[PDB]
Paper text:
Protein synthesis is essential across the tree of life and undertaken by the highly conserved macromolecular complex of ‘the ribosome’. mRNA translation is regulated at many levels, but until recently the ribosome itself was not thought to be part of this control system. Here, we have characterised ribosomal protein heterogeneity across 4 tissues of Drosophila melanogaster. We have solved the cryo-EM structures of three different ribosome complexes purified from complex in vivo tissues; 80S ribosomes from the testis (3.5 Å), 80S ribosomes from the ovary (3.0 Å) and polysomal ribosomes from the testis (4.9 Å), improving the resolution from the only other previous ribosome from D. melanogaster.
We performed a similar experiment with ovary 80S ribosome preparations, collecting a dataset containing ∼200 000 particles, and resulting in an average 3.0 Å resolution (Supplementary S10D–F). While the ovary 80S average did not contain any densities in this region, the testis 80S average contained densities that did not correspond to a tRNA (circle). The IFRD1 density was not present in the ovary 80S structure, suggesting far fewer ribosomes are inactive by this mechanism in the ovary. Specifically, the three switched paralogs (RpL22-like and RpL37b in testis 80S; and RpS5b in ovary 80S) showed the largest differences in their atomic models out of all paralogs. Whereas in ovary and head there is >16 times more RpS19a than there is RpS19b. This analysis confirmed paralog switching for RpS5b in ovary, i.e. there is ∼2–8-fold more RpS5b in ovary 80S ribosomes than RpS5a. The importance of the paralog-switching event between RpS5a and RpS5b has recently been functionally characterised in the Drosophila ovary. RpS5b specifically binds to mRNAs encoding proteins with functions enriched for mitochondrial and metabolic GO terms in the ovary, suggesting ovary RpS5b containing ribosomes translate this specific pool of mRNAs.
Author numbering:
A (entry chain AN): 2 to 151
B (entry chain AW): 2 to 130
C (entry chain AX): 1 to 143
Write the structure that this text describes.
RNA sequence: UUUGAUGGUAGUAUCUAGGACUACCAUGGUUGCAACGGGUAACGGGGAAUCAGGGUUCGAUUCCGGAGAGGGAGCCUGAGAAACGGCUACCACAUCUAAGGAAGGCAGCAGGCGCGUAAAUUACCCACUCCCAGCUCGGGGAGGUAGUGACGAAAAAUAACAAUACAGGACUCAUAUCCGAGGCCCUGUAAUUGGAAUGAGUACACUUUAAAUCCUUUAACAAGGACCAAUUGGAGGGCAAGUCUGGUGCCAGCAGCCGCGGUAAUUCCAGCUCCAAUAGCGUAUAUUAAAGUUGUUGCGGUUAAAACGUUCGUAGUUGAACUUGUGCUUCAUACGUAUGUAAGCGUAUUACCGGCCGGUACUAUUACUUUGAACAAAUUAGAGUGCUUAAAGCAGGCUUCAAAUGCCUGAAUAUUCUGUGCAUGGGAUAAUGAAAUAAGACCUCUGUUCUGCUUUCAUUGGUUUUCAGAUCAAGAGGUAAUGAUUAAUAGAAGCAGUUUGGGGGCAUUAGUAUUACGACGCGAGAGGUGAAAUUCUUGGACCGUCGUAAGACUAACUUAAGCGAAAGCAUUUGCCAAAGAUGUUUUCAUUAAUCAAGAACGAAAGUUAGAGGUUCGAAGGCGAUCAGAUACCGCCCUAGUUCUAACCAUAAACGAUGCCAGCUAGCAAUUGGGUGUAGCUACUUUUAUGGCUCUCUCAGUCGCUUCCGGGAAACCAAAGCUUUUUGGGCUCCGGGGGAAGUAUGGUUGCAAAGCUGAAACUUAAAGGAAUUGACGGAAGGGCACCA
RNA sequence: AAGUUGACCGAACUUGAUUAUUUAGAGGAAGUAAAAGUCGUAACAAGGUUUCCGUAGGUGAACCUGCGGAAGGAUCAUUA
């Protein structure tokens, strides 16, 4: 593992075999609709909505309580992001390495960490322009980029 | 990364029978590789194996006898017609008494004795003797 | 070790063995044009010439004998080489500035044994087949 | 690509398409899947040489195709030529000439010169096969046919049968590692001698053929070795074969390599013998096999030659699982058993008529694969066949010794011309494809919208509806389980996440030390070293001491710990940005793997430009030692070490070991995280925490022990799973040693130099891991009056 | 018919550039063979200053020295 790092450590979620459990849920299964988007209107990316509802409702996995995933439910409401989330956070990192480098030069090991994160924004761009959620003519230019993520 | 499931479940068989274990755990059982063992099951080499059905990719816990000697895969899957099927049994299998080279012919997954009577050709999928 | 074992790597394989045959000393010897530029023989088995001088090559030690060679200028491109004559006798049978036929020695161009540098061997001298006049079945003409 | 390159457009031109040519617009076209350029000792293909396969090398050469007639250009006539056994000119060579001029092209067949290692007669005829003409009849150095011919293939002279002569073992038997008789189921050497065969020659005639020759067929002649007379290489090993005899004496020479030879040579030179293949065989160059030393089958890269210093990274090469799978009922079918052809349930594997059966409407795709089609022969594979056999040949055979259109059958089938392309079967494997707030499907078949045109308005015209062959859109609000596979012990990203680490940057700050100076006490020494001297004491040194100041370096704690891509990283504290790992019923959904080119970093030294300048210290200058000492040792020191802003791009940049992935074992430690130990345990009260305890658990890293491991070993849980030439994927590098990382070109650089990178010539060994001796500034343990 | 005007094919020579080979060269400097010459002993034994590497400077010559690295070392190391 780790395309840009040595550390081959494995860790993930272990989703069980049973699907439709909770067998104890208080309300409708599809009343997570009006709490995916009511916390989607607070600017939360669907990673944060997948874990804020593990503890209040507390729903286990959304793709078994409803029919489909969290990102598909938000654009059924109409809260899909301008740029998808694993590029929104991958660019905000590469923004911050450049803002650290416009005051702290002599640093050839924060610069190296920028070439890493920029060589993989160019790998998620090169894929999202194939599956057509990013259009063509969409590049990483690092002079407009800081007004996207902020 | 795994460019074959068939290599990462046939060396895993072959490494566990030269030590003489009686059960091998293979991962993660493409239906290509189930019908490879089913060729080997009905010629005695393999016991009645069990497919644990977890809904990610699958796992098999394959029983075996100990009659196996070398059960590997050929890669890349060379397309073999019928007239050049014996250039791949001569230089590969130990003698023309026994052993098989398994083919994925146009009809199914079969060995090289059933394919030469049914008159089918295909790709080489692996070998066992 | 190495080689790409994918289905569509016939491009790399024939590229590689073309690339890597140029390390072999036997391939590249016959594929560089020096059987005419470096070979004083014209890429061929024999050559004819006219001699210059009858000389003694000092043999490489442990062996120690002056070796009685002949330095000849072949007429094909004027290059001046040194050939070895066998089978003692063989220089009272030469009588300098007779036309000689010269061949190789045996190790496919380069030098052979105790004689350093000398790579060629005299076959006929004044048409009368030196191996046959050595056993006196042919006589060299007094003309 | 000005001067046609890519296209459009109109033309011209040609037999015709066409930038083929013109004019006007357009700016295209090819390219790392190798364009362009160069080389070629390149005519292409059929095919040839050689191997078990996979293959390498060659093909001027009789067959098809192209090409050209000394070099180029032009052209006439002709259906056909840019023809040269046609012409015209120029160029180069030559020719004749009475000096005005005229003609010539053998890379046709012969022949001569020349070059060469390298290749034959200045012969005979159109009978053959066919071609051409006005064309049964002419012509055809096309073609056939003799002469030369050891290129190469085939069949095979150089004796054979007996006798005694001298002789061997063996058979019977006196006898048995002694010995006679029948010496013999033996074979040799015999110019003993005497016999039987014969083609080699020879010669009448014959057949032969266009006329011949040769062979075959042949009346007469023709073998006794002294001749009809077999030689080429070798006799140390590799390699089957005299430790023969004379000669020479590291000479002469031999030997592919290893090796021989120095007045005994198993290797030379000869004699006497012997062994190999034999009308042959030796040598030279090339080439194939040998070669698992080119590696697709099938190599090697820790140490033998070889993982880029590091990581990104495009081209490229490779890429997780998932979809109608079968079950029953059966019956056809090898022996209550076996369906291996098929038929019946998973709501409809394509609608009609014909008498289960045919016309018949309809076919997501490509790779692969089945059988085909399709196409030259010779070759090759090779069927059949007594040219006497043979290689060949495509004939021949029979009734039959016949009479006899009197018969019979030939003259296969294939690799090849491997692939492309086409037809057909298959649908395993592998890609693409589809339905997302539906420009989704059938439907709501609504007529809202269509498109159109042939049949009739007798003919023929106007009014205009229907079927409208077809084609757009349906009255959209209604009837379709109305549509999104998994979530990889793949990746990515997140987290109310808790952390953790000499990771990098910037500030801040501490520690003693080493200097250098200031005071003060002291008194003649002090540095140093093998011994020294250089050196420091105008004594106030050395030393002791309080100090101030400066630049360096961060000890001890310090590990078989940690972090980092690698080079590297250690005084606190703050701030900055980043990272692995663990945890996670988080998120996305194949985004991943590795990598030419290209990018970023890259110890030290060296280089630039400043600021520093303690310690150290190449260079330099002294003192010793030493035969010598430009060295080691000792003194002050310079560039440098230091910081900044750039350059450079190399290290034994090492684990001499590329990266992702799966598997295979013990044993003990520790780094980090998690989770049960009322295991202990610090005390707010025990609890909350912290410390450890054993017990688990991830990612490992160390360590040691041996495999069912492997290797030449040393050795290694990888360097193994490289079976019984094996196969998870990707990339780089090597092919005996030198010459040499040189020369040269290109490129980078301020330079130093870096990344690329040969050949001539030389060489029979270089090298790796181990073993025994050697038994030395190698440690250990011992011994002796030759200590 | 000659002869002619203009176009177009164009040989050919003269000049320039561009390649692609081959060759003469004072001097200079590396390599190989040649052991049997001179000088010293660099390395391998703790080769008598352990060796090697990268990099700079210096030296009749092998070599020397600084800085950094490695063990292919003469330490796999015992020091709560």
């Amino acid at each position: 593992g780790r395309m840009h790092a040595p550390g081959k450590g494995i860790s993930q979620s272990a989703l069980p075999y049973r699907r439709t459990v909770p067998s104890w849920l208080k309300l409708n299964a599809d009343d997570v609709k009006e709490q995916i988007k009511k916390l989607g209107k607070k600017g939360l990316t669907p990673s944060k909505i997948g874990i804020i509802l593990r503890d209040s409702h507390g729903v286990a996995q959304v793709r078994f309580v409803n029919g489909n995933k969290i990102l598909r439910i938000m654009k059924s409401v109409g809260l899909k992001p301008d740029i998808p989330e694993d590029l929104y956070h991958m660019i905000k990192k590469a923004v911050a390495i450049r803002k650290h480098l416009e005051r702290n030069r002599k640093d050839k090991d924060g610069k190296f960490r920028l070439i890493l994160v920029e060589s993989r924004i160019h790998r998620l761009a090169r894929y999202y322009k194939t599956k057509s959620v990013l259009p063509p003519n969409w590049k990483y230019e690092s002079s407009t980029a800081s007004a996207l993520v902020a | 990364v795994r460019m074959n499931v068939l290599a990462d479940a046939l060396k895993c068989i072959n490494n566990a029978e030269k030590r003489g274990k009686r059960q091998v755990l293979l991962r993660p059982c493409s239906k290509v590789i189930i019908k490879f063992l089913t060729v080997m099951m009905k010629h005695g080499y393999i016991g009645e194996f069990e497919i644990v059905d977890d809904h990610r990719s699958g796992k098999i816990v394959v029983n075996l006898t100990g009659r196996l000697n070398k059960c590997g895969v050929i890669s890349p899957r060379f397309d073999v017609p019928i007239n050049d099927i014996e250039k791949w049994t001569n230089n590969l299998l130990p003698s023309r008494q026994f052993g098989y080279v398994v083919l994925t012919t146009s009809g199914g997954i079969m060995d090289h004795e059933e394919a030469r009577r049914k008159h089918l050709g295909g790709k080489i999928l692996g070998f066992f003797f | 070790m190495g080689k790409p074992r994918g289905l569509r790597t016939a491009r790399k394989h024939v590229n590689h063995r073309r690339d890597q045959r140029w390390a072999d000393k036997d391939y590249k010897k016959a594929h560089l044009g020096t059987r005419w530029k470096a070979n004083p023989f014209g890429g061929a088995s024999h050559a004819k010439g006219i001699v210059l001088e009858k000389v003694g090559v000092e043999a490489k030690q442990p062996n120690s004998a002056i070796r009685k060679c002949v330095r000849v200028q072949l007429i094909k491109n004027g290059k001046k080489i040194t050939a070895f004559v066998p089978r003692d006798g063989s220089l009272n049978y030469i009588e300098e500035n007779d036309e000689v036929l010269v061949a190789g020695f045996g190790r496919k161009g380069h030098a052979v044994g105790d004689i350093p540098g000398v790579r060629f061997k005299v076959v006929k001298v004044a048409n009368v087949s030196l191996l046959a006049l050595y056993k006196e079945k042919k006589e060299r003409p007094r003309s």
